[PDB]
Amino acid sequence: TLWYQTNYVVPPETPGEAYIIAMGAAQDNFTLKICKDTDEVTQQA
Amino acid sequence: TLVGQICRYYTQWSGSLKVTFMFTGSFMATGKMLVAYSPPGSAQPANR
Amino acid sequence: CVVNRNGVLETTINHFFSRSGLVGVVNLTDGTTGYATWDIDIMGFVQLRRKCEMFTYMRFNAEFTFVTTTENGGARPYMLQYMYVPPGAPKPTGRDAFQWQTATNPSVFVKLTDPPAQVSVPFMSPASAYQWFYDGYPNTTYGLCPNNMMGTFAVRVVSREASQLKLQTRVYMKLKHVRAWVPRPIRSQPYLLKNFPNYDSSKITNSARDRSSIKQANM
Amino acid sequence: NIVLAYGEWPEYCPDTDATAKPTRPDVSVNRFYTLDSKMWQENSTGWYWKFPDVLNKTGVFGQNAQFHYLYRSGFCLHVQCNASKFHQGALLVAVIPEFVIAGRGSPHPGFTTTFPGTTGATFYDPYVLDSGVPLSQALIYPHQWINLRTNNCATVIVPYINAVPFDSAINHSNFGLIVIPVSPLKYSSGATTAIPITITIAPLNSEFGGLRQ
Amino acid sequence: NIVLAYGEWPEYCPDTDATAKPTRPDVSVNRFYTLDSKMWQENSTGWYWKFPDVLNKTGVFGQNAQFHYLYRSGFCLHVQCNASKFHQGALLVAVIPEFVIAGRGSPHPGFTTTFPGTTGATFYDPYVLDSGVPLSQALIYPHQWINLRTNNCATVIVPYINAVPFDSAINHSNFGLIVIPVSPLKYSSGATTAIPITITIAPLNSEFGGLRQ
Amino acid sequence: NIVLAYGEWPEYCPDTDATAKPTRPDVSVNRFYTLDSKMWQENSTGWYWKFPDVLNKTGVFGQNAQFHYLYRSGFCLHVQCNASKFHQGALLVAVIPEFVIAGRGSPHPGFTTTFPGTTGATFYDPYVLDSGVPLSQALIYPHQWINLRTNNCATVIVPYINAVPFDSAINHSNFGLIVIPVSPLKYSSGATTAIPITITIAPLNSEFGGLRQ
Structure with missing residues (x-):
């Protein structure tokens, strides 16, 4: 989750909106297993 | 994301993930946030 | 449920292409050409x-x-x-x-x-390796690489008599000693042409389905 | 600070064949070229270039890529932007090898669509990079964030990534440079509307071989 | 005296994976819990329990099996009964792993049929153990006779018998404890009718990992 | 930077009497609790809390102060506030032992007047601290200025100040934390009206002894 602890404080003459992007990856102990063909692509030829 | 794509192959998987946030505001502003994780047994929290 | 780890013998690049699959279907139908390229x-x-x-x-x-x-x-x-x-x-x-x-x-x-x-x-190319993208010109001459020509097969029945068979032939393919050099992200949009990445920008598929709002984690 | 692509430090020829011969130009060609500076607004959408196509018909290096048909070099991109502390928004610098503009509408693209010249071209579909590739996965490449609250430079060193160890410098194109505004730009009223973006390019270890005319 | 199941002396984790971490509780949880005592009569038929299901919602250990979803422990069952020298009959103490109540009448069993709670459930078919298994062959398991002319205690130590080295403590169930009166009880008239049976349970080397709420 | 009250570095029991015994909790209770954040305006007047009363019915520490009737700990208050460089005004952080709300109007105070709970109470007479004590003399105590042009943190370490070396954690109250805006807050128009104030509390060397229920 992502809660608010204090409302966003601007100085005067500053737009009071912003954006927060989110990034993700995997650590080093990440393992896999039995192969399987995919599902997202649908058609053929 | 990419790690959400190759896991559509490879029927089972395990490991640890990190999540990185970053911010796109002006230099003057300042506000605190709370980034909380919940354990996978139960539902999401309700209050602060 | 799962507490142990697994191995790294299966995530490697040699095993990622190693198993074989269908690639083609041809038809002979000798009655009337009599062959199939x-x-x-x-x-x-x-x-x-x-x-x-x-x-x-x-x-x-x-x-x-x-x-x-x-x-x-x-x-x-x-x-x-x-x-x-x-x-x-x-x-x-x-x-x-x-x-x-x-x-x-x-x-x-x-x-x-x-x-x-x-x-x-x-391996049959004058370059050091194949390419799957070639930016430039060797309108229709764009992106046609002269370094992927590999050949044909030209199945033909052997007779003197013009037998009346009607056949179907499948081709399976396996790869060996694969070495890949540089990565790139996976294509999301569907395909239209066989040899061009065109994607019909009148409508664009998304990468995630929608949901109710941003405050409900339950999808 | 700097980001070195794939860990190379680009070098000269590895004692190649069919050279007896290839010249090594002096510091008359190792100078910081500065291309033109665009303008980035509230509703802008992106830019890209091509290499070594934006350096042609320009300077001393223009007078060697059109009279030689064997070529090898490595570049040092130095993207810099200038803005005060009352603006916001974030850019994205990415150096992608083998950059192909696809084309739209169910129809091959034109000449100036794929070879822009010095003034770089713009996008139409920044969400799918005009090749059907989502921007969410687009950070496998050498990337470096320009974020207008922390830093104002982004230095990328690019080696010579190519299959054949000598290619031409007119028809083929090694890579491209995309700059995509991920965040929209907002600012309080009264201040400057446009914020510039400038580039700086310097060749590292350029070789040449085989002469024309 | 004591009977040690399968020769183990249960131990901690064997340096398991996906723990950086797992806590080891103090002697606040290593105390002798005492469940309720049933009554055994002339026409009684049997009892059984489940582990670790009869220890839930109870004590400090109840406040860890419902806020952790990784679990591992071993138990020390101490069955004791008290009767004077003018009564007769023989019990049977058996600790069976993977105890499944089947169900009867040619129809799945209910909730409280298979998870009894603290007050243990009774049988209906003591001859075939409610799984189609005859009691004549039922001493492969760790067993220990309580015989009312010789001894009055039966101590069983049970290690952690499980396939996956960490399972949950709510849905899964490791084993059960059956107590079957093989002999009927008879006694001369005038004396006490009911004879009690009490239990004692103490965890050995309980671990916990992963927290909820 | 930090301000250490009276020069103590709080420690454990000095080999006390009537302990054979008292437990020392692990790092499950040594985590940074964060209370709620108030809002400070142009016409606001003050706040205060009580310890260890604002930590009850909260977390793991709530599940030990209501099942033990002997208690001893020391706290680490970490007051922090966030405001841009176009605001002004100065706070005051003071940690006063034995803080008594008196009551007004020539009439004892109520329950929630003297035990506030997590949301702290406000003043009515900030000039005389609701005890008939002038604020001009009120800096004998451990104090630390938060001044919005220089610094934004104020760290106070408090040892266990008490007469009897073990007291209860429900009825008695060790000390309190007052935050008084000495300067009024003014700011030019158009900017943010409210400026938050947040707290952070972490126990140091908490002991417990004697169990209930």
Whole structure:
């Protein structure tokens, strides 16, 4: 989750909106297993 | 994301993930946030 | 539920291409041409196309298998011919022309009742590796690389009599000693042309389905 | 600070064949070229270039890429932007090898669509990079964030990534440079509307071989 | 005296994976819990329990099996009964792993049929153990006779018998404890009718990992 | 930077009497609790809390102060506030032992007047601290200025100040934390009206002894 602890404080003459992007990856102990063909692509030829 | 794509192959998987946030505001502003994780047994929290 | 780890023998790049799959279907129908040509291209189905465009420079041998049936199922004994054309030689035109008796074209004579044939092809490009993207010009001359020509097969039944068979032949493909060089992200949009990445920008598919709002984690 | 692509430090020829011969130009060609500076607004959408196509018909290096048909070099991109502390928004610098503009509408693209010249071209579909590739996965490449509250430079060193160890410098194109505004730009009223973006390019170890005319 | 199941002396984790971490509780949880005591009569038929299901919602250990979803422990069952020298009959103490109540009448069993709670459930078919298994062959398991002319205690130590080295403590169930009166009880008239049976349970080397709420 | 009250570095029991025994909790209770954040305006007047009363019914520490009737700990208050460089005004952080709300109007105070709970109470007479004590003399105590042009943190370490070396954690109250805006807050128009104030509390060397229920 992502809660608010204090409302966003601007100085005067500053737009009071912003954006927060989110990034993700995997650590080093990440393992896999039995192969399987995919599902997202649908058609053929 | 990419790690959400190759896991559509490879029927089972395990490991640890990190999540990185970053911010796109002006230099003057300042506000605190709370980034909380919940354990996978139960539902999401309700209050602060 | 799962507490232990697993191995790294299966996530490697040699195993990621190692198992074999279908790539092509041809039809003979001798009654009436009497043969069937087929180009060598791994960009036949979208399932193998979406995997192999995760990279940009690959280097790999290959080995094929020809598995044939009849139309009904009864496999009477005959004798076929699977030829091969290295890139630069002219393809066959009729079933009895003089491109079936040369010495540069390796032939494979196999019956029908025997177990299926098998043959491997070495790496055949003047470059150090193949390319799957080529920016420039060697309108229609855009993006056509002269360094992916690999050859044909030109299946032909062997007779003097013009037998009345109607056959279907499948081609399976396996890769060996694969070394891939640089990565790139996976294509999301569907395909329209066989050799161009065009994507019909009048409508764009998204990468995630929608939901109710941003405050409800339950989808 | 700097981001070195793939860990190379680009070098000269590895004692190649069919050179007896290839010249090594002096510091008359190792100078910081500065291309033109665009303008980035509230509703702007992106830019890209091509290499070594934006350096042609320009300077001393223009007088060697059109009279030689063997070529090899490595570049040092130095993207810099200038803005005060009352603006916001974030750019994205990415150096992608083998950059192909696809084309739209169910129709091959034109000449100036794929070879822009010095003034770089713009996008139409920044969400799918005009190749059917989502921007969410687009950070496998050498990337470096320009974020207008922390830093104002982004230095990328690019080696020679190519299959054949000598290619031409007119028809082929090694890579491209995309700059995509991920965040929209907002600012309080009264201040400057446009914020510039400038580039700086310097060749590292350029070789040449084989002469024309 | 004591009977040690399968020769183990249960231990901690064997340096398991996906723990950086797992806590080891103090002697606040290593105390002798005492469940309720049933009554055994002339026409009684049997009892059984489940582990670790009869220890839930109870004590400090109840406040860890419902806020952790990784679990591992071993138990020390101490069955004791008290009767004077003018009564007769023999019990049977058996600790069976993977105890499944089947169900009867040619029809799945209910919730409280298979998870009894603290007050243990009774049988209906003591001859076939409610799983189609005859009691004549039922001494492969760790067993220990309580015989009312010789001894009055039966101590069983049970290690952690499980396939996955960490399972949950709510849905899964490791084993069960059956107590079957093989002999009927008879006694001369005038004396006490009911004879009690009490239990004692103490965890050995309980671990916990992963927290909820 | 930090301000250490009276020069103590709080420690454990000095080999006390009537302990054979008292437990020392692990790092499950040594985590940074964060209370709620108030809002400070142009006409606001003050806040205060009580310890260890604002930590009850909260977390793991709530599940030990209501099942033990002997208690001893020391706290680490970490007051922090966030405001841009166009605001002004100065706070005051003071940690006063034995803080008594008196009551007004020539009439004892109520329950929630003297035990506030997590949301702290406000003043009515900030000039005389609701005890008849002037604020001009009120800096004998451990104090630390938060001044919005220089610094934004104020760290106070408090030892266990008490007469009897073990007291209860429900009825008695060790000390309190007052935050008084000495300067009024003014700011030019158009900017943010409210400026938050947040707290952070972490126990140091908490002991417990004697169990209930």
